[PDB]
């Protein structure tokens, strides 16, 4: 038999034994997203966006047998990481929270997908905004293969794009626009296009006048897949 | 010289010779547990070079 985390009314699965008899198991896994930061709210001066979360982290469709696994297992799954909140007032903004990280492990195997990490505040300064490192992959006991997740996007002063992510693991959250000084707005970038089941990270959000601006974009909800034979 | 007395029991002495309760204290999570032993896996033997 088969779990996955698409399945309605799972649950978070912390030392339950392997299946009686069972011969071993095939193991997927993916990170959640980190949620994005946002910017500075105010009427003058320069506005920098906040940056994009990374990508979640991913190992691939791979064996374990029960000679191999323990007694019992964990199977932790990634929740998506909270988006950065409003400045409340006329100032900078927050960072986002990074993703849950995603873990099997059982005996002498560990597999880890790990959250991509928050978008960085946007503040008063040009270096500000910073993007979230993509979640990294851990393998212990077997000889898997796994993806590390997609860069999360700048805001500050030169606002991206999230890196896009086909190779199993997740894309990162496009960066926050901004204002200047003495003239007009200026652009934010795109979240990356994925196929991974690792979540995708929040795009960040811009710099903007006092009564402007949102809450930064959410990380997506990591993924679990273990089949049993 | 080498005399000894008979050994004379603890409760004969009215001694309490008890050890104490094994202080008991409110754990982390098992969620965060597993992430840690998680985190803690990755940094020996026979994961690669470490």
Redesign the interface.
Same mark, same amino acid.
């Given at each position: 038999f088969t779990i996955s985390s698409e399945d309605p009314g799972y649950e978070?699965l912390?030392?339950e034994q392997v299946p009686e008899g069972a011969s071993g198991c095939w193991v997927t896994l993916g990170g959640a997203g980190g949620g994005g930061g946002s910017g500075r709210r105010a009427n003058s001066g320069y506005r920098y966006g906040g940056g994009g979360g990374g990508g979640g982290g991913y190992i691939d469709r791979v064996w374990i047998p029960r000679a191999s696994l323990g007694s019992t297992f +964990?199977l932790?799954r990634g929740l998506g990481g909270a988006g950065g909140a409003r400045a409340a007032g006329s100032s900078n903004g927050n960072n986002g929270a990074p993703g849950g990280?995603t873990?099997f492990?059982s005996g002498?195997v560990?597999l +880890?997908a790990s959250g991509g990490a928050a978008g960085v505040k946007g503040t008063s300064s040009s270096a500000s905004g910073s993007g979230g490192a993509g979640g990294t992959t851990?393998?212990?006991?077997v000889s898997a293969t796994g993806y590390t997740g997609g860069k999360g996007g700048n805001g500050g002063s030169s606002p991206s794009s999230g890196q896009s992510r086909t190779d199993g693991s997740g894309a990162g959250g496009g960066g926050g626009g901004g204002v200047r000084s003495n003239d007009n707005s200026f652009s934010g970038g795109s979240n990356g296009t994925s196929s991974g089941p690792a979540g995708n990270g929040g795009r960040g959000t811009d710099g903007s006048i006092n009564t402007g601006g949102s809450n930064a974009g959410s990380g997506g909800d990591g993924y679990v897949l273990i089949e049993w034979e | 010289a080498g005399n000894e007395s008979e050994p004379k029991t603890l409760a004969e002495l009215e001694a309490e010779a008890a050890t104490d309760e094994l202080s008991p204290a409110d754990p982390l999570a098992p969620a965060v547990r597993a992430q840690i032993d998680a985190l803690v896996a990755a940094k020996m033997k026979p994961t690669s070079g470490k």
């Open positions: 978070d912390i030392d +964990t932790i990280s873990v492990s002498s560990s +880890t851990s393998i212990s006991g | -």
